[PDB]
């Protein structure tokens, strides 16, 4: 009725702070893993060159 309640009440602030920091860390890790992937596609000049060769030019 007296002791354990008081010590729990004393614990609350530090635990709240640490859990907030942990959530911020999770969000930071989520953001840090985001990279924009620039894809590379076959240049159409080679396609045009192959078209010309097929014409026997």
């Amino acid at each position: 009725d007296i002791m354990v309640p008081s010590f729990v009440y004393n614990k609350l602030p530090v635990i709240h702070f640490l859990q907030e920091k942990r959530a911020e860390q999770k969000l930071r890790r989520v953001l840090d893993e985001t990279y924009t992937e620039w894809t590379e596609e076959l240049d159409q000049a080679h396609v045009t060159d192959a078209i010309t060769r097929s014409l026997n030019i």
């Binding site: 076959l42 080679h46 396609v47 192959a50 078209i51 097929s54």
Partner: protein, 37 residues
């Protein structure tokens, strides 16, 4: 260009009928094949 040539140059147009659709179809098929590879 010294020397009398035997023939007068004329346009090499011999395939009088070459539909644009067929040419673009072949270009598409070649393009698809290269892209797949």
């Amino acid at each position: 260009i010294s020397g009398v040539s035997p023939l007068l140059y004329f346009p090499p147009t011999t395939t009088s009928t070459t539909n644009r659709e067929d040419q673009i179809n072949k270009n598409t098929n070649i393009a698809i094949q290269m892209i797949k590879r």
